[PDB]
Design an enzyme around this catalytic site. Sequence first.
Site, PDB file in Angstrom:
ATOM      1  N   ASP A  65      41.828 -77.328  21.994  1.00 17.29           N
ATOM      2  CA  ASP A  65      41.675 -78.004  23.276  1.00 17.29           C
ATOM      3  C   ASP A  65      40.287 -78.138  23.887  1.00 17.29           C
ATOM      4  O   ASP A  65      39.680 -77.178  24.370  1.00 17.29           O
ATOM      5  CB  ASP A  65      42.688 -77.468  24.289  1.00 17.29           C
ATOM      6  CG  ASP A  65      44.062 -78.097  24.109  1.00 17.29           C
ATOM      7  OD1 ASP A  65      45.058 -77.501  24.574  1.00 17.29           O
ATOM      8  OD2 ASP A  65      44.140 -79.193  23.502  1.00 17.29           O
TER       9      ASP A  65
ATOM     10  N   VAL B  73      52.950 -64.476  25.392  1.00 18.96           N
ATOM     11  CA  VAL B  73      51.612 -64.160  24.935  1.00 18.96           C
ATOM     12  C   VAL B  73      50.634 -64.256  26.082  1.00 18.96           C
ATOM     13  O   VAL B  73      49.542 -63.701  26.025  1.00 18.96           O
ATOM     14  CB  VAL B  73      51.155 -65.123  23.848  1.00 18.96           C
ATOM     15  CG1 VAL B  73      49.744 -64.807  23.453  1.00 18.96           C
ATOM     16  CG2 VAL B  73      52.057 -65.025  22.643  1.00 18.96           C
ATOM     17  N   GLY B  74      51.020 -64.964  27.131  1.00 16.31           N
ATOM     18  CA  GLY B  74      50.137 -65.091  28.269  1.00 16.31           C
ATOM     19  C   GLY B  74      50.309 -66.370  29.054  1.00 16.31           C
ATOM     20  O   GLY B  74      51.278 -67.115  28.859  1.00 16.31           O
TER      21      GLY B  74
ATOM     22  N   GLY C 294      48.107 -68.837  32.540  1.00 18.08           N
ATOM     23  CA  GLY C 294      46.907 -69.231  33.239  1.00 18.08           C
ATOM     24  C   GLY C 294      47.144 -70.528  33.976  1.00 18.08           C
ATOM     25  O   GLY C 294      48.289 -70.940  34.173  1.00 18.08           O
TER      26      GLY C 294
END
Lengths: 130, 334
Positions: B164, B26-27, B29
């Site tokens: 978060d 999904v990704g 970073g």
Amino acid sequence: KIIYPNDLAKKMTKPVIIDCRPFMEYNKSHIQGAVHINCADKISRRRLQQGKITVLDLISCREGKDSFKRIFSKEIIVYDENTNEPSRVMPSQPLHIVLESLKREGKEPLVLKGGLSSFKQNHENLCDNS
Amino acid sequence: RPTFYRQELNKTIWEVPERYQNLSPVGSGAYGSVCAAFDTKTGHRVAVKKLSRPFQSIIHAKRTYRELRLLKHMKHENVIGLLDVFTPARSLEEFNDVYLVTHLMGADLNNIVKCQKLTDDHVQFLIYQILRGLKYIHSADIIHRDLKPSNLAVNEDCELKILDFATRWYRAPEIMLNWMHYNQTVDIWSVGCIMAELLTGRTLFPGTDHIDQLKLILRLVGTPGAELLKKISSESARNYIQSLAQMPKMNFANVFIGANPLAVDLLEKMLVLDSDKRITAAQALAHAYFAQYHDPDDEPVADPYDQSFESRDLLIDEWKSLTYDEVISFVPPP
């Protein structure tokens, strides 16, 4: 119990309509005049299975002088996305939750066969959009 | 211990228990990589975050420690919760990979607002929920500090979770210019900004670089009072305001035209410049805007949260092990 897309069409031009599809689906499009109801989520189900609140009670907050006229002053239609055979609807389905809650308040609701998906075969002009 | 199955997704290698299946990138970073999955042992589409290089620094080791402890603590329908945490490593020495599992929550308040226009009940239900977990989070004596639409997850049933703990558009004035006098009420300013967006589809304080951010804010709530001004901090901050042309407080009833009256009254209570006058989460829960949904018995609080470790200063070895401890002392929910 169950009504037909056609009967509703005519029934319409001159009844309370409840849409129990997912809020984002409801906002994408709903049968004109249809009112939305959040009931499937945990908090809703809970407080419902506790009288904390009840469907009919909820939707009684869109007035200006009297909060019940036009509400329980009409037959109540209920619809979901596409349930064709309402007779059989799981206890989790939003359709079930509403019907049980309304019936629990001595109200005889009418479910639109085939929900919104059906009603759009030849009634697109009776719907709101984006 | 279960049975993991290695695999390679987008140049990173994922090693996860048999129960998690259909991993879909999904990704990623800074934080780490995340795969969308399906937990056969629960029926839930879930999100698996692979945390790599969690110990390539003291700052990082601690950070990794913090996030985990914090995540293990929250147990509330409206707050991100840990469904599972695991490591293929068998020994504290072979340890240097952390995987966090949570309900895959589709969409975020950002996406929703940019897609469709919500009804007042939607706005009301969404904000009720933000407040409910905000009450919980504050109970444990924790401040979120970065509450914004992109941190608000919403599923198809309109259920929401806080995640978060652009950002400047929702930051409260006090913690804006950096003053050491903030508190829990700083998150309420954010909820107010958010509510305003829900109600109008328009960012309330889209400031460029936070100078004007303060200008935009002042332009609405009005330039400080006589004592209110004497209720602040900083040197600069203090001067700027006086350096500005005194503006009068606007009447929200004119800003939020056609909006539910009880809404604008609530905003009137959250978007207050004096954080000491700003309504609390608990107090907001009771406002008339949440009538149909307010149930004191159905609005839990957390247990105190030991932020003690925070003070101590340790070395990678310590923090690292300290983390393994948490990873092992993990009790799944039921």
